[PDB]
Ligand binder design. Structure first.
Ligand SMILES: NC(=O)[C@H]1CC[C@H]1C(=O)N1CCc2c(OCCO)cccc2[C@H]1CN1C(=O)c2ccccc2C1=O
Length: 284
């Protein structure tokens, strides 16, 4: 399977889309986004890539995006899908049972607690029960058919909270907080363990990575990345974690690091074409 990157920001939101294969280590340029947008998330359902939320390039008035769009790698064609109820810049996303869950994100000065679910069958959104916190820069990631809305910023406090959602009950549960504060962290599940790689805390942009096992309900640290970064893209391919892009305060990273859980070691496997922050990453 190929890993992708959609959108991104480099002094300007980027309309790019690219693809990568770990078996040969090569980059493949693909059909550019119809509207450029950073601060967005991406995912795949039914072998079609999706590019949820973000922020338009403009640059005029106010343009946070409530925009859902779908890509077909076989035909290489972008379609426009039903737009979310509210704009969501700095958004996370997760998928349960073939539905797409938009969680949080900013719209102007408003930092959303609201959440909405997308059915591809029908092509429409349904506003679900909101989170207990407000969260922009929020890492979403799914563990055994439950949605963990990790970290974020609420409008005044950068947070270490990492509440969880129960689709069967339709309610949110405030579980155990992270050791390190993380706004703009990247989160993706692997082997019954949620991971929180990098982000921004206050002074420092972080390189530290920590891992959440459910029962014990504790955040055990893991080997940190080489480069410190928030706003990174993140995903999993073949029992390893791949961390694309970043914003280290002073530069936009073109690095791509790979975490091997089998050894607890980070290793760079390549470099992107042009370094950017705020991509939407997925795998098919
Ligand atoms: N779409 C946006 O909001 C864009 C507005 C510029 C860019 C932006 O602010 N971003 C990039 C995206 C992103 C994010 O992405 C969500 C992935 O789903 C999650 C959390 C934070 C960010 C910030 C990180 N950041 C920068 O790139 C940057 C550049 C220059 C000065 C300050 C910053 C700065 O703070």
């Amino acid at each position: 399977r190929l890993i992708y990157t959609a959108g991104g920001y480099f002094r300007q939101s980027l309309s790019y889309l690219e693809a990568y294969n770990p078996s040969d280590g090569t980059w493949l340029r693909l059909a550019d986004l119809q509207v450029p947008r950073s601060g967005l998330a991406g995912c795949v359902v039914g072998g079609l890539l999706y590019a949820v939320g973000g922020r338009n390039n403009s640059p005029d008035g106010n343009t946070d995006s409530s925009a859902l769009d779908c890509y077909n790698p076989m035909t290489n064609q972008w379609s426009p899908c039903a737009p979310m109820s509210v704009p969501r810049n700095r958004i996370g996303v997760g998928v349960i049972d073939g539905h797409i869950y938009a969680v949080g994100g900013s719209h102007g000065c408003i930092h959303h607690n609201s959440v909405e679910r997308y059915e591809p069958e029908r092509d429409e959104w349904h506003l679900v029960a909101p989170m207990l916190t407000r969260r922009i820069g929020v890492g979403v990631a799914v563990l055994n058919r439950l949605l963990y809305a990790v970290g974020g910023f609420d409008g005044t406090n950068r947070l270490n909270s990492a509440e969880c959602y129960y689709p069967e009950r339709n309610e949110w549960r405030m579980i155990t907080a992270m050791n390190t504060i993380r706004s703009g962290a990247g989160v993706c599940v692997l082997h019954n363990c949620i991971y929180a790689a990098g982000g921004y805390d206050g002074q420092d942009q972080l390189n530290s990575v920590e891992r959440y096992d459910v029962a014990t309900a504790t955040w055990t640290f893991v080997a940190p990345m080489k480069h410190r970064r928030s706003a990174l893209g993140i995903t999993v391919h073949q029992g390893r974690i791949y961390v694309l892009g970043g914003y280290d305060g002073h530069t936009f990273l073109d690095s791509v690091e790979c975490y091997d859980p089998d050894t607890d070691t980070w290793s760079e496997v390549t470099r992107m074409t042009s370094g950017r922050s705020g991509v939407g990453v997925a795998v098919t």
